[PDB]
């Protein structure tokens, strides 16, 4: 079968289709029009966007396909280096860092991070308790304050103190501006035009800021000798069982940069979309709030109580279904192979997995695919293989999944325990795209139930 291809622009092929404010949503509309697979070409590049569980279940076979760096991840590698997300599977530092960090990211490790997550969650709740009557909440903004502070504290015992400020931390200014340059660079029809020389000088300056600040975090910790129970201590002290080697300081810096990207708007986006869907679905909100009140019987949640917030967990999975905040990942064929009995691929051929569109496969989810129904996730065994991929696939899946879900379940549970929510503007969903997704301008009012944290 010859696969379809969206409209072309002469020698720029399909590249101008990406020169839009909302490229993921544009690719979703192309998939609506063209179906489960389409070819996408740009100067020097061919890939194939997959959208059906039928084809993606094959693409997730690690004997046939391995992780590819998309152009986006190749550009992120200019500042995240051979950290875990921007490493190829065959680089020594991927498997080394993977083996060392897996124990730091397990459910067991979450028991140790729990108290630091609570510290930040209580700050969020106190901020909202302290708002004046008729004041509102800027939801993505506050969710990013919470997720950034949580990965700073659990990551390297650093307080970004995001609830004390409006202006971002200098590291975050350079990180966000670096990610903006990545997005801009993907959209340039003529990337070598001297009109972008200033952008490139700024990008290099931002790389240096991130390196300098993280290198000093690492140097300061080695100099103090402090043994806090954070990711940095584990990286300084751990040895890979396979090679017997530790990570060196440059790779530790790249991992820290990698975690800060991941724990910033990628994770806060999940909380923002979850709260959006809850306020647009009042019966779902009521059920989740009933669970929070039943389970969260103490002034601060315990680790075991967060594990008991089963419906809150289903709410988060259903938000990941509709708007997964890391919306694509890339693969390449390890050898010649045929996809779906119809599409022959050659060794090295690239695939993109378009996750929001996979999650809209009606052959899997049924006709009500746009509805927000957390009960879809009552039983993971009832979900077909590779139908639900917000955290990627296989050995290259998200190492932070348990971390992101624990922090999100904890704070959403506390939010639902402590406040009633009003969609006071009847907010119209507007999804802003960076390399992640967020409901731009999403605001609510939160009326306290006046339940103390003491
Ligand atoms: C809801 C929040 C998150 C989502 C949806 C998410 C999604 C993903 C996805 C889709 C991938 C695979 C990317 C690819 O194949 O190119 C990935 C990888 C990864 N994520 Fe996350 N992520 C989240 C939060 C986090 C957090 C909080 C951390 C750590 C602080 C983290 C650390 C990583 C790492 C290190 C990898 C690379 C794993 C490897 O290849 O060995 N992620 N994430
Ligand atoms: O595949 C990725 C990268 C997703 C990586 C997730 N991530 C990692 C760190 N922060 C976020 N983008 C997509 C969509 C896209 C297209 C053009 C411009 C921007 C985005 C693509 O190129 O098709």
UniProtKB/Swiss-Prot annotation:
(9Z)-hexadecenoate binds at residue 49. One of its GO terms (cellular component) is cytosol. Changing residue 391 to H: High substrate-free turnover rate constant. Negligible substrate-induced spin-state and substrate-induced heme reduction-potential shifts on addition of saturating concentrations of arachidonate. Changing residue 391 to W: Large decrease in the heme reduction potential in the presence and absence of substrate arachidonate. 10% reduction in efficiency to couple NADPH consumption to substrate monooxygenation. Changing residue 80 to W: 800-fold binding affinity for laurate as substrate. Low coupling of NADPH consumption to laurate formation. Very much more effective in indole hydroxylation. Favors omega-1 hydroxylation. Its main location: cytoplasm. Changing residue 259 to E: Ineffective covalent modification of the heme macrocycle. Substantially slower FMN to heme electron transfer for the arachidonate-bound enzyme. Product distribution biased towards omega-3. This protein is a target of protein engineering. Its selectivity-directing and activity-enhancing mutations have been extensively studied and the designed mutations allow this enzyme to act on non-native substrates and/or in order to enhance production of synthetically desirable end-products. The keyword Transcription does not apply. Transmembrane segments: none annotated. The record marks 266 as: Important for catalytic activity. It is found in: Cytoplasm. Changing residue 80 to F: 800-fold binding affinity for laurate as substrate. High coupling of NADPH consumption to laurate formation. Very much more effective in indole hydroxylation. Favors omega-2 hydroxylation. Residues 1-453 are annotated as: Cytochrome P450. Heme binds at residue 398. Induction: By pentobarbital. Expression is negatively regulated by repressor bm3R1 at the transcriptional level. One of its GO terms (molecular function) is identical protein binding. Changing residue 262 to H/K: No significant stimulation of NADPH oxidation induced by addition of fatty acids and no hydroxylated products, but cytochrome c reductase activity levels are identical to wild-type enzyme. More negative reduction potential with dithionite. Keywords: Cytoplasm, Electron transport, FAD, Flavoprotein, FMN, Heme, Iron, Metal-binding, Monooxygenase, Multifunctional enzyme, NADP, Oxidoreductase, Transport. Changing residue 262 to Q: No effective fatty acid oxidation. No effect on electron transport from NADPH to FMN. Nearly wild-type level of high-spin conversion with laurate/dodecanoate, palmitoleate and arachidonate. In the N-terminal section; belongs to the cytochrome P450 family. Functions as a fatty acid monooxygenase. Catalyzes hydroxylation of fatty acids at omega-1, omega-2 and omega-3 positions. Shows activity toward medium and long-chain fatty acids, with optimum chain lengths of 12, 14 and 16 carbons (lauric, myristic, and palmitic acids). Able to metabolize some of these primary metabolites to secondary and tertiary products. Marginal activity towards short chain lengths of 8-10 carbons. Hydroxylates highly branched fatty acids, which play an essential role in membrane fluidity regulation. This is Bifunctional cytochrome P450/NADPH--P450 reductase. It comes from Priestia megaterium (strain ATCC 14581 / DSM 32 / CCUG 1817 / JCM 2506 / NBRC 15308 / NCIMB 9376 / NCTC 10342 / NRRL B-14308 / VKM B-512 / Ford 19). The lineage of its organism: Bacteria, Bacillati, Bacillota, Bacilli, Bacillales.
């Amino acid at each position: 079968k010859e696969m379809p291809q969206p409209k072309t622009f002469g020698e720029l092929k399909n590249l101008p289709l990406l020169n839009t404010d909302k490229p993921v949503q544009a690719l979703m509309k192309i998939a609506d029009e063209l179906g489960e697979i389409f070819k996408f070409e740009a100067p020097g590049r061919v890939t194939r966007y997959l959208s059906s569980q039928r084809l993606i279940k094959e693409a997730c076979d690690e004997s046939r396909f391995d992780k590819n760096l998309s152009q986006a991840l190749k550009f992120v590698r200019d500042f995240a280096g051979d950290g875990l997300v921007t490493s190829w599977t065959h680089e020594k530092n991927w498997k080394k860092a993977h083996n060392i960090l897996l124990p730091s990211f397990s459910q067991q490790a979450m028991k140790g991070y729990h108290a630091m997550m609570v510290d930040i969650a209580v700050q969020l709740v106190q901020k909202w308790e302290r708002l004046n009557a008729d004041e509102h909440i800027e939801v993505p903004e506050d969710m990013t304050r919470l997720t950034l502070d949580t990965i700073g504290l659990c990551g390297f015992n650093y307080r970004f103190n995001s609830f004390y400020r409006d202006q971002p931390h200098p590291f975050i200014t350079s990180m966000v501006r670096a990610l903006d340059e990545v997005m801009n660079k993907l959209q340039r029809a003529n990337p070598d035009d001297p009109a972008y020389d200033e952008n490139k000088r700024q990008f290099q300056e931002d790389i240096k800021v991130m390196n300098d600040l993280v290198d000093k975090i690492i140097a300061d910790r080695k100099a103090s000798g402090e043994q806090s129970d954070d990711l940095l201590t584990h990286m300084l002290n751990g040895k890979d069982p396979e090679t017997g080697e530790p990570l060196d300081d440059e790779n530790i810096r790249y991992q820290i940069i990698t975690f800060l990207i991941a724990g910033h708007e990628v994770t806060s986006g999940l909380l923002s979309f979850a709260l959006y869907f809850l306020v647009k679905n009042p019966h779902v909100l009521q059920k989740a709030a009933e669970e929070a009140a039943r389970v969260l019987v103490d002034p601060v949640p315990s680790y075991k109580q967060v594990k008991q917030l089963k419906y809150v967990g289903m709410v988060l999975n259903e938000a990941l279904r509709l708007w997964p905040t890391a919306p694509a990942f890339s693969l390449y064929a390890k050898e010649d192979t045929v996809l779906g009995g119809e599409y022959p691929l050659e060794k090295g051929d690239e695939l993109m997995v378009l996750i929001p569109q996979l999650h809209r496969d009606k052959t899997i989810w049924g006709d009500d695919v746009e509805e927000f129904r957390p009960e879809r996730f009552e039983n993971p065994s009832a979900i077909p293989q590779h139908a639900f991929k917000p955290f990627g696939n296989g050995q290259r899946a998200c190492i932070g999944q348990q971390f992101a879900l624990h922090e999100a379940t904890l704070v959403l549970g506390m939010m639902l325990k402590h406040f009633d929510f009003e969609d006071h503007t009847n907010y119209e969903l507007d999804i802003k795209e960076t390399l992640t997704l967020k409901p731009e301008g999403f605001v609510v009012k939160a009326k306290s139930k006046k339940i103390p944290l003491l």
